Amino acid sequence: NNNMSLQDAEWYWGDISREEVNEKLRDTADGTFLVRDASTKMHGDYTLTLRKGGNNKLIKIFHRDGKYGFSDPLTFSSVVELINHYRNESLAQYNPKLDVKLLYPVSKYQQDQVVKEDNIEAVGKKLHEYNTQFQEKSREYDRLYEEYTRTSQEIQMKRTAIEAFNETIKIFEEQCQTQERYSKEYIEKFKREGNEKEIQRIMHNYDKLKSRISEIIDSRRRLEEDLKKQAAEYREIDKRMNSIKPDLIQLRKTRDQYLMWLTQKGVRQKKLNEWL
Template sequence: MQELESAPTLPPKGHVRTSQAALFEPSTPILSASELGLSEAEWYWGSATREKIDDLMKDTPDGTFLVRDASSKVGEYTLTLRKGGCNKLVKICRNRQGRYGFSEPYRFNSIPELVQFYRSESLGEYNPMLNVKLLYPVSRLQHTEEVEASNSDDLGKMRKQLESAHLEYLNRSRQYNLYRDDYSRCSQEIQFKKQASDAFDVAVLMFEEQLLLHDKFQREAHRHEIYCLKENYELLKSQMSKLKQSRQELQENLRGQAVLSRNLDREMNVLKPELNQLCKTRDLLQTKFLSTVLVYIQQHPSSVHADSQHWLLPDCSRSTAESLLAGKADGTFLIRRSAGAPFALTIACHGVEKGVGHILIYRSERGFGFTEPYLLFQTLNDLVVYYAGHSLEELNPKMNTTLAYPLHG
């Protein structure tokens, strides 16, 4: 007779559900380790629409990627990869054993494991048309921070974020320019050394031909000619040996230059998407800051400040401006043309030397301003109206005043 299995141990009475409805209560799903890792991955965008993905991937370099839920079937995923300036959609498959891959055999225990593998290996082994690695993840976390920053109504906080983003962009740009300059010099040196190497090859070939001729002449020469031919032969051999040694040193140096060139190229390629992202962040914050400025200008109309005839003296010199503002109340100002920039602000302020200060006003394709990244004002009038209500202290700690009184107001 078959032996029966022992009955399972009963749970403690305190754990017995007395309600019939409780038997049908849904339990909270427990994420597997691989699913938990996926949800925390910066490159995983969940159920983001294809339109949003296209916008995120726009103008990104080859190798940029992200993963999202497949729109066709629940539980499947799609890798979006930039290649050849276009977005390539690659289905991530899963077999019954829970392993992932692009095609059989599926060898990855999770999608993060798959992504990590192809960060260092080309997808060319899966599809020769996709001969690129997963180089640049589109970060969902960074995007969220940018959106939060763009939605902030705190002007002071926004200014700090904008300045920080601009400073980081400048630092990265300088680093990229250094790499680019070094790469350019390295490329020129490689070109020159390749030409020198080719010249060495020609010279060595000529010496080898001469040695063959000397060998032939020695066999055919008279006895009294052999000694001189041998001397010349040994001299040619010595010179050719030196040539080969120099060529070898040049080739070793050339290999070192080639390694340096590849490293510099790789560093530039790493920085490019980062620069692009920093530029997008800065532009986003600039746009938000500008919209806040425009709202302020609309809410604070001032016929005196908005009319340039009260404060614009285009032909006024620096010394004349100082004379006109000497002894005036703090915040009395005018704007004039300048040699160092399109315009300059001259303002009475007891906190600066002589009681009169000067700030250059620059102009970019976006507008006027005192310094980057604030060259945003479409007209000088907008700049004046804005700083009529905001202190110049943020530009110069000694100028604790606003553009309070136009000279001819």
């Protein structure tokens, strides 16, 4: 019949934690599901988790008097019966607000065959070839992250000095226009006696003001040289991380899939830290 034992249910996982079911129903299409043993451990509860639109729904499978189901009238034989009944029927039978059908089961033989090197002799060597690089994406990613967070600390300082020079340079120019107000009628037009004090008084005072107002503008224009050289390099190190972060996500799916295929399912070793 279609009533088999849940020991061979490919969608059946059994004894795993709530925090590993969450990253198996993460960003997946609706009607994705699996069944595992309850956490309260009554030996035969088998909770069900359903992914209906973002959220992970969680459904109970009661086990009174050798019968199965969701409601009080438990009227099914096995979970392989109850799970196959809803892989082609709608869950709106039980819940009018849960019109979903158990479409995509989360298998486990799907990724156990993706592994290669059937003999264990190549498993330890196809393993050490994938832990030298994941332990290199560790260093290669933090060598180019402090250099990122550091340069972000420098741009915020240089960008503040420019608000310093844009204030200073405006404090000098506000005097050249108020200097000219006085210098035209109070001390030179009234002093028309052919004296040379104006060449020493205003001609030697107005010159040092103009040798300062431009003297500061030559350092604001100079400060922005390294700010532009630095804001450009801040994007070059922000682009190098993006070409490294996704490849740093794949090597964490290849080591763990080689630390489980034979490294633990083939043996329960405390020998983990020499065959890596």
